Design a binder for this molecule. Structure first.
Ligand SMILES: Cc1cc2nc3c(=O)[nH]c(=O)nc-3n(C[C@H](O)[C@H](O)[C@H](O)COP(=O)(O)OP(=O)(O)OC[C@H]3O[C@@H](n4cnc5c(N)ncnc54)[C@H](O)[C@@H]3O)c2cc1C
Ligand SMILES: NC(=O)c1ccc[n+]([C@@H]2O[C@H](COP(=O)([O-])OP(=O)(O)OC[C@H]3O[C@@H](n4cnc5c(N)ncnc54)[C@H](OP(=O)(O)O)[C@@H]3O)[C@@H](O)[C@H]2O)c1
Length: 532
């Protein structure tokens, strides 16, 4: 489009979160419009088009549930949907509900300011648009600002330079190239086996080794799909009533109580079945360091037995941090890749990168000559997208400033001093610790219900109570401190961005309990919010 001067609700972001908000707000009888930087819908599945890109949550879980028609119609094809497929899904939903007529594309919001006189937001874009809106919904993502390390050589590299979160829209040809991949999180583990098949030589620059387990992907049986469809709302209600927003089995035992022989036998069953459910095999894997370590060691042994050169294998073995505290990764022929002659593991812990050079990468041991260099170096997560926008609350406080020692929220949904502003599936909430379609739908519903409630009662200003926000922040840190999550440098704590404050940013109590807390809050008239 071309955006309206005035609107009840402005939404930023046209991925999963913004599309649903735009959908539900129209149903609720509210004027609403979306501004999005990308050329089209999809959010992470529009930007992340690198080869091998693929979801780690089963296709049947990772999908919308607000529309029965969508659930009956869509045909998923495999256990874990590839990126192109998930993008076809999102295009399908966008077409079905005519969503694009409410979205300005190619447009980046740059500043937003709350106006105490009118109880409204004024939102500016990089095209010179100015929009006035009663409420502001930031659906701008969790993993939406690419993080490029500030390596000394970078702007001098004479080859082709890429980042997996901003991938060309036409396939890139690596045939006969020497190619370097920096980063071995889920992006790098998924991209490298694809590049390994085209490149003359592939150098995988690893820092901390991450734990990954086999995906065991497979065709989805069309019979099973037809069968699921008969009870689809029931199946999703079951997933909503869990810590993780999926059908993972919640292992009741402690990893410490079991004999060696029972532990091997349980873990081996998880490993053969494939997928991430091993994380919840015993109740204390994320709570107790001796529990965690008996599982970790099982995993490190599978890695040693997968790679034939034991020197290379040992370099791949994760050390230094508890299993499950960086995101657990699903791999498809990633370890086996290192048995190819043309694939090299460069351990940068023992040989740190000193600089990028015109021809390649220099570590303390040698220089590597490369035609292309792929950064799988992640995202300035959870706060990176909000921080790129000049957002100003009451008394002209900048959000960037209030949150400079870490995000401060009530329920993650709002921050005090910034009335009428909501963050979708961000810091202070379950967010990426659960299936994100479950986190996102529940936030979009709770916020849009809240906005409908304000118009219904002729209220115009919603603001979190400062003391409740402070209590909520404290609570989030205290329950996080009963787990091993804060022990490790991950994007969850911000420790991947130099200078970023190190605080575990997510609610760890599980989706289900959080959902309960949010319903209790709404049921009592939005206790902990002041409305006028
Ligand atoms: C490659 C990858 C794979 C994933 N795999 C899974 C999975 O297996 N499990 C899981 O549960 N989740 C996974 N995620 C997490 C993912 O973030 C969520 O599942 C979900 O897609 C987030 O949707 P969103 O709408 O909340 O944000 P996004 O998908 O990131 O959408 C936000 C949009 O806002 C736009 N935007 C940002 N700032 C501005 C601005 N200033 N002005 C205008 N527009 C702006 C962005 O361009 C983006 O399009 C994955 C993440 C990535 C990066
Ligand atoms: N399959 C999927 O469903 C999928 C795919 C991609 C992304 N995602 C989501 O998005 C998240 C991020 O994935 P990601 O792989 O893009 O990023 P990541 O998990 O943040 O990993 C970034 C990688 O780059 C390395 N790195 C960062 N800075 C570096 C530096 N200065 N020098 C050398 N190495 C550096 C990190 O090393 P260290 O660990 O040593 O810091 C790590 O190996 C995932 O955890 C998941 O939530 C999901």
């Amino acid at each position: 489009r071309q955006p309206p001067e005035e609107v009840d609700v402005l939404v930023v972001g046209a991925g999963f979160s913004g599309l649903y908000a735009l959908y539900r707000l129209r149903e609720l009888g509210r004027s609403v419009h979306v501004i999005e930087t990308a050329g089209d819908v999809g959010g992470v599945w529009y930007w992340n088009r690198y080869p091998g890109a693929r979801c780690d949550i089963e296709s049947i879980e990772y999908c919308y549930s607000f529309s029965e028609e969508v659930l009956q119609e869509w045909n998923w094809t495999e256990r874990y949907a590839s990126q192109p497929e998930i993008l076809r899904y999102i295009n399908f939903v966008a077409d079905k509900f005519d969503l694009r007529s409410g979205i300005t594309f190619h447009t980046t919001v740059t500043a937003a300011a709350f106006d105490e006189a009118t109880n409204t937001w004024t939102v500016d874009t990089n095209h010179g648009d100015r929009i006035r809106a009663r409420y502001l919904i930031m659906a701008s993502g969790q993993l939406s600002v690419p993080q490029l390390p500030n390596f000394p050589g970078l702007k001098d590299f004479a080859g082709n330079l890429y980042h997996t979160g901003n991938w060309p829209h036409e396939p890139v040809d690596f045939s006969g190239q020497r190619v370097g991949v920096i980063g071995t999180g889920s992006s790098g583990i998924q991209v490298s086996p694809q590049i390994a098949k085209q490149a003359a030589e592939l150098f995988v620059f690893q820092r901390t080794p991450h734990f990954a387990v086999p995906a065991r992907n497979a065709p989805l049986d069309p019979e099973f799909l037809a069968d699921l469809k008969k009870r689809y709302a029931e199946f999703r209600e079951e997933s909503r009533n869990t810590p993780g927003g999926t059908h993972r089995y919640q292992g009741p035992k402690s990893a410490l109580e079991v004999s060696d022989e029972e532990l091997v036998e349980t873990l081996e069953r998880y490993w053969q079945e494939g997928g991430p459910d091993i994380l919840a095999a015993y109740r204390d894997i994320l709570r107790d360091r001796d529990a965690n370590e008996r599982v970790a060691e099982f995993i490190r042994n599978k890695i040693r037995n997968t790679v034939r050169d034991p020197e290379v294998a040992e370099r791949l073995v994760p050390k230094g941090y508890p299993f499950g505290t960086k995101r657990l990764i699903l791999e498809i022929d990633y370890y086996e890749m290192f048995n190819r002659d043309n694939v090299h593991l460069v351990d940068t812990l023992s040989a740190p990168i000193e600089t990028i050079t015109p021809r390649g990468v220099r570590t303390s041991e040698r220089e590597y000559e490369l035609d292309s260099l792929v950064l799988a170096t992640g995202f300035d997560a959870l706060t990176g997208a909000l921080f790129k926008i000049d957002i100003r609350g009451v008394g002209n406080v900048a959000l960037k400033e209030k949150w400079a020692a870490g995000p401060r929220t009530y329920l993650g949904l709002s921050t005090a001093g910034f009335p009428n502003l909501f963050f979708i599936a961000g810091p202070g909430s379950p967010s990426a610790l659960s299936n994100m379609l479950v986190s996102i739908e529940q936030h979009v519903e709770w916020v849009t219900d809240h906005i409908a409630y304000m118009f219904k009662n002729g209220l115009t200003r919603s603001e979190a109570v400062l003391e409740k926000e402070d209590e909520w922040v404290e609570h989030v840190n205290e329950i996080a401190d009963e787990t091993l999550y804060p022990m490790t440098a991950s994007w969850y704590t911000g420790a991947n961005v130099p200078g970023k404050p190190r605080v575990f940013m997510l609610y760890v109590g599980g989706f289900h309990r959080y959902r309960q807390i949010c319903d209790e809050v709404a049921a009592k008239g939005y206790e902990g919010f002041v409305l006028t």
